Amino acid sequence: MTPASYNLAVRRAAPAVVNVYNRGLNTNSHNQLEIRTLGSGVIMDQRGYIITNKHVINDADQIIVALQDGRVFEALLVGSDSLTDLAVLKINATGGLPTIPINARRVPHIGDVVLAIGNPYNLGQTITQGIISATGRIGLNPTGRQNFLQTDASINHGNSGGALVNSLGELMGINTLSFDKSNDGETPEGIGFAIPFQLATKIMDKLIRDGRVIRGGIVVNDLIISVDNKPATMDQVAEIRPGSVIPLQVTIQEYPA
Amino acid sequence: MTPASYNLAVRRAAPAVVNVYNRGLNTNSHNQLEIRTLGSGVIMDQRGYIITNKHVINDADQIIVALQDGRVFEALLVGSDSLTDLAVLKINATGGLPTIPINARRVPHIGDVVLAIGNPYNLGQTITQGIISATGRIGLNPTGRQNFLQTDASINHGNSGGALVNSLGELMGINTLSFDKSNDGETPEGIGFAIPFQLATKIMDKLIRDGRVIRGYIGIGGRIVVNEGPAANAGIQVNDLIISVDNKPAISALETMDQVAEIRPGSVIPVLQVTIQEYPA
Amino acid sequence: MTPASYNLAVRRAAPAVVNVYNRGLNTNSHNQLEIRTLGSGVIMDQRGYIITNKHVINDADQIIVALQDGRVFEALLVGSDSLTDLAVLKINATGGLPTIPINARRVPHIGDVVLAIGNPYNLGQTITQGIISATGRIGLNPTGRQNFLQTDASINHGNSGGALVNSLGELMGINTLSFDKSNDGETPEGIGFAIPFQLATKIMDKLIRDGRVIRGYIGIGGRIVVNEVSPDGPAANAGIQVNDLIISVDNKPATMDQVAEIRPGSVIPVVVLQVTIQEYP
Amino acid sequence: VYQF
Amino acid sequence: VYQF
């Protein structure tokens, strides 16, 4: 017998999980190299793109990305989205980059064993083990438009933006937050959230293309039987393209504010 | 290769775990059912009996049960037990019901992987995994003593009344309270308790049968000699022992404790001849 | 079928981890023994040598070791080490002792499932599971270096000194403490440390042999090359240094492991002087 | 101990 | 940091 282990998921995925440092300019004298926040990110491919949470790089003058191999790089903010708290970066690294196992044909199920890869309290890269607790959740929100994976894998400050992989090493999600406070005197335990790797990819490619996110039975609160040319959904509207007319004559466009 | 996953136990057991809402009258000013507390429950068998925690349905003016499949119901409180913090609800279904896999021959082992299934903070049904950290527990603070199963599967507010199942999906226990905020020290991590299924099964039957648990009480509690009641008023002495209660030697005391409790009130019993009474409220 | 379980690891390892109690004579005003602290311990071999944490037995008047089998012993303190926070006790037993399973050729890996064995909050022996989260650890804010194992297996007060084992029940580390962070704003979940068994073992033999861990204090503190934090001592009494590099110490590319292990009292050739190693304060 |  |  051999010790039970998820080392395989570690070897396959961890190298691609990097430490992210959001550095801003301060008034301590001229300190412009002070960390503001820090977190994690995932090298998505050989071109140097990295996914991470928006709140981790917001208002930054400089983003450093560190790899478990030692290398460090000045990072380029290529785009971000306030609705998914997602953000893409780019690191000009030739010589090769370790990448995160991806498997678009995989459906994550509840009960699936997972591992959060990150950099809590900047202690260094750490792996935590849990399972997929739930799917299609709003998480911590006034109710927006996105579904999160819920996990009991332990995530702490510094895990934001890092990877949530399965026992095979396949990206399942981008760890976002950990169910903040509670009502009565009790600290919740084991309730974390990640953005499904599918949404994470749709938003990445969009950010990479338009430098940002282009966002466009059923009754208005009259009633709308259908939209464009298909049954009535409040989700498709955005996936059209600003300046597109569809049946009355209504023309959609940007989703500001 | 394939992804290690306990989703099987999830498909098998989770359909049977439900949301319990403890509603009460005018919680603002005007008469209207307000949601006082949340909880979970487990559907035990097809008749519609559901186990949950007593602390969850106390002072409920209206108890509502919501199935994971969409159905909702007003449930009737068939009964509860304080000494075990167990309650039983009944709902009248007709389309059939998802019931919890129960394997009465299975004996839980320390280290068995388990899944806590419940509705934490009303975020919707969630599953968490740990192991059985310990068995035969909570005897270091005996008042209304009981046996517990210990686990490091994340238990949060809202998980009470819910299920603890093994990798196969079998019911191992009913998640009750969580060891939280010791004193002023700190927040204990991964210490959670559940009533062992066997004890929950014996308590439910009692609740379905009599609407309450009828314990056999005599009158000799000192924390088999009687070292300090209504039953000792005809046959029992003071500082003496008793090899056979009901004229059958149960070696120790704890066994005589349960045996006696298992004895229905009124039944004359030879300690001398004393008749059993019901344990005082 | 068969439930997923780490019970096999529990059955082989748990009998060997003990409940350690620290009792004092000047704790109450009646000078009767009272627990001032408690934690866990691990019986290493049959001579009665048990490893535990220093902070658990510090300044005790009596150290009590309780085994899962019911036996209780008074323990002798053979030695401790601030640097690693390891202590080694000795109970005098007859009739045999349960000893921790050890596989000196097993290399712990990040991702290996591990089980923490101990007495959190004195609830009795409890087992929790997680994985090995990291290796070669502990903050970039040291003082005296000794690296740990990091794990997400729930560790609580009382778990200290206890065992962290893999699925085969092999000893991976000695749990030492759950990162309870430096201040407030949040409670860290799942961050715990343990002294790798290889290190724990070496240190124990050194305490057993010499009653304390003799290291190598040459006299060159800094913040390689001679640095800038503090002033030198007996280390400059042979090699003039206040701001100069250092090639290779003792004929090997230059690292304080050897330094501390060189045996105080031996002239050593340091490239880029003939200094003789001295014992740490 | 016993208090039954 | 360090001290030898």
DSSP chain C: ----B-HHHHHHHGGGEEEEEEEESSSSTT---EEEEEEEEEE-STT-EEEEEHHHHTT-SEEEEE-TTS-EEEEEEEEEETTTTEEEEE---SS--------TT----TTBEEEEEE-GGGS--EEEEEEEEEEEES-S--SS---EEEE-S---TT-TT-EEE-TT--EEEEEEEE---SSSSS---S-EEEEEHHHHHHHHHHHHHHSS------S-EE--B--SSS---TTTTTS--SS-B--BBSSSB--HHHHHHS-SS-EEEB---EEE-----
Active-site residue, selected from the candidate residues A80, A133, A160, A178? A160
Give the Cα separation of A17 and A42 in Å (integer): 5
Could E4 and C227 be called an inter-chain contact, meaning their C-beta atoms sit closer than 8 Å?
no
Chains D and B are touching, with contact defined as 3 or more CB–CB pairs separated by less than 8 Å: yes
Give the Cα separation of A85 and A90 in Å (integer): 17
Report the candidate in A243, A159, A145 with the shortest Cα–Cα distance to residue A199.
A145
State the CB neighbour count (10 A cutoff) for residue B215. 22
Give the Cα separation of C96 and C121 in Å (integer): 28
Residue in the structure block whose two tokens are 């959230």: A193
Identify residue A108 by its one-letter amino acid code: P
| Cα separation values, A26 from A35, A56, A60, B218, Å | 10, 17, 11, 76
Nearest CA in chain E to C260: E4
Beta bridge partners of C253: C248
User: Could you tell me if C131 and C23 are in contact, meaning their C-beta atoms sit under 8 angstroms apart?
Assistant: no
Beta bridge partners of B49: B45, B90
Which residue blocks in chain B are alpha helix, DSSP H?
7-13, 54-57, 197-210, 254-261
Paired tokens of A127: 């792996």
Give the Cα separation of C39 and C58 in Å (integer): 12
Chains B and C are touching, with contact defined as 3 or more CB–CB pairs separated by less than 8 Å: yes
User: CB-based contacts of B204: which residues, under 8 Å, 6+ apart?
Assistant: B44, B49, B51, B86, B88
What is the Cα Rg of chain B in Å?
21
- Which 5-34 residues of chain C touch chain B by CB within 8 A? 5-10, 14
User: Could you tell me if A85 and A51 are in contact, meaning their C-beta atoms sit under 8 angstroms apart?
Assistant: no
Secondary structure letter of residue B280 according to DSSP: P
Nearest CA in chain B to A134: B126
Identify residue C98 by its one-letter amino acid code: P
Work out the burial of residue C255: count CB atoms within 10 Å of its CB; fewer than 13 is exposed, 13-18 middle, 19 or more buried: middle
Rounded to the nearest angstrom, the minimum Cα separation between C109 and chain A is 7
Active-site residue, selected from the candidate residues C81, C85, C112, C152? C85
Residue A221, helix vs strand vs coil = coil
Identify residue B213 by its one-letter amino acid code: V
What H or E segment, with its residue span, contains residue A12? helix A7-13
Identify residue B144 by its one-letter amino acid code: G
Paired tokens of B107: 């004996």
Rounded to the nearest angstrom, the minimum Cα separation between C254 and chain E is 13
- How many Cα neighbours within 13 Å face the side chain of C91? 30
Active-site residue, selected from the candidate residues C55, C157, C232, C250? C55
Could A6 and C131 be called an inter-chain contact, meaning their C-beta atoms sit closer than 8 Å?
yes
Query: Which domains can be identified in chain B, with CATH numbers?
Result: 1-104+197-213 (2.40.10.10), 105-196 (2.40.10.10), 214-281 (2.30.42.10)
Paired tokens of A249: 């004559």
User: Could you tell me if A133 and A150 are in contact, meaning their C-beta atoms sit under 8 angstroms apart?
Assistant: yes
| Cα separation values, A163 from A73, A148, A160, A195, B234, Å | 19, 14, 9, 10, 73
Report the candidate in B219, B243, B248, B241 with the shortest Cα–Cα distance to residue B232.
B219
State the CB neighbour count (10 A cutoff) for residue B24. 15
User: CB-based contacts of C33: which residues, under 8 Å, 6+ apart?
Assistant: C23, C24, C25, C27, C61, C62
Nearest CA in chain C to E1: C223
Could E4 and C142 be called an inter-chain contact, meaning their C-beta atoms sit closer than 8 Å?
no
Give the Cα separation of B258 and A194 in Å (integer): 49
CA–centroid distance for B41 within its chain? 11
Give the Cα separation of C64 and C51 in Å (integer): 13
The values of phi and psi at residue B143, to 5°, are: -120, -80
User: Could you tell me if C16 and C9 are in contact, meaning their C-beta atoms sit under 8 angstroms apart?
Assistant: no
Residue in the structure block whose two tokens are 């030739």: A94
What H or E segment, with its residue span, contains residue B190? none
State the CB neighbour count (10 A cutoff) for residue B183. 5
- How many Cα neighbours within 13 Å face the side chain of C129? 32
Give the Cα separation of C98 and C108 in Å (integer): 23
* Number of helical H runs and strand E runs in chain B: 4, 18
Secondary structure letter of residue B185 according to DSSP: S
CA–centroid distance for C144 within its chain? 13
Give the Cα separation of A197 and C51 in Å (integer): 45
Secondary structure letter of residue A229 according to DSSP: T
Report the candidate in B153, B193, B189, B181 with the shortest Cα–Cα distance to residue C155.
B189
Beta bridge partners of C61: none
Residue B118, helix vs strand vs coil = strand
Rounded to the nearest angstrom, the minimum Cα separation between B266 and chain D is 17
State the CB neighbour count (10 A cutoff) for residue C228. 10
Longest alpha-carbon distance in chain A = 69
Longest alpha-carbon distance in chain C = 73
Give the Cα separation of A204 and A200 in Å (integer): 6
Residue B14, helix vs strand vs coil = helix
What H or E segment, with its residue span, contains residue A138? none
Secondary structure letter of residue B279 according to DSSP: P
User: CB-based contacts of C276: which residues, under 8 Å, 6+ apart?
Assistant: C238, C265, C266, C267, C268
Give the Cα separation of C193 and A140 in Å (integer): 30
CA–centroid distance for B207 within its chain? 11
Could C152 and A157 be called an inter-chain contact, meaning their C-beta atoms sit closer than 8 Å?
no
Residue in the structure block whose two tokens are 């999906």: B169
What is the Cα Rg of chain E in Å?
4
User: CB-based contacts of B126: which residues, under 8 Å, 6+ apart?
Assistant: A133, A134, A150, A191, B117, B118, B119, B120
User: CB-based contacts of A210: which residues, under 8 Å, 6+ apart?
Assistant: A79
Give the Cα separation of A46 and B159 in Å (integer): 44
Write out chain B residues lying below 8 Å of C115, CB-based: 111, 131
Could B128 and A186 be called an inter-chain contact, meaning their C-beta atoms sit closer than 8 Å?
no
Give the Cα separation of A4 and C8 in Å (integer): 12
Whether C55 is a known active-site residue: answer yes
Rounded to the nearest angstrom, the minimum Cα separation between B214 and chain C is 30
| Cα separation values, B217 from A70, A197, B214, B260, C240, Å | 71, 60, 9, 7, 87
User: Could you tell me if C37 and C75 are in contact, meaning their C-beta atoms sit under 8 angstroms apart?
Assistant: no
Residue B165, helix vs strand vs coil = strand
State the CB neighbour count (10 A cutoff) for residue C177. 18
Give the Cα separation of A155 and A153 in Å (integer): 6
- Which 183-212 residues of chain A touch chain C by CB within 8 A? 187, 189-190
The values of phi and psi at residue A169, to 5°, are: 100, 0
Q: Is A111 left (phi over 0), alpha (psi -120 to 50) or beta?
A: left
Residue B62, helix vs strand vs coil = strand
Paired tokens of C244: 């100069």
On whether any CB of chain A is under 8 Å from the CB of C135, the answer is: no
Paired tokens of A41: 């990110």
Give the Cα separation of A49 and A27 in Å (integer): 32
Q: Give partners of E (≥3 CB pairs < 8 A).
A: C
Rounded to the nearest angstrom, the minimum Cα separation between A217 and chain C is 44
* Number of helical H runs and strand E runs in chain A: 2, 16
Give the Cα separation of A26 and A48 in Å (integer): 29
Chains C and A are touching, with contact defined as 3 or more CB–CB pairs separated by less than 8 Å: yes
User: CB-based contacts of A242: which residues, under 8 Å, 6+ apart?
Assistant: A214, A216, A252, A253, A254
Write out chain C residues lying below 8 Å of A158, CB-based: none
Dihedral Cα B92, B93, B97, B103, nearest 10 deg: 20
User: Could you tell me if C19 and C65 are in contact, meaning their C-beta atoms sit under 8 angstroms apart?
Assistant: yes
Residue B88, helix vs strand vs coil = strand
Q: Experimental technique used?
A: X-ray
Work out the burial of residue C257: count CB atoms within 10 Å of its CB; fewer than 13 is exposed, 13-18 middle, 19 or more buried: exposed
End-to-end CA distance of chain C: 60
Q: Which residue numbers of C belong to the known binding site for substrate?
A: 143, 218-223, 280
User: Could you tell me if A131 and A111 are in contact, meaning their C-beta atoms sit under 8 angstroms apart?
Assistant: yes
Q: Which residue numbers of B belong to the known binding site?
A: 143, 218-223, 279
Give the Cα separation of A128 and A151 in Å (integer): 11
The values of phi and psi at residue B80, to 5°, are: -155, 160
Give the Cα separation of A229 and C13 in Å (integer): 66
| Cα separation values, B272 from A23, B245, B277, C161, Å | 86, 10, 16, 55
Could A5 and C139 be called an inter-chain contact, meaning their C-beta atoms sit closer than 8 Å?
no
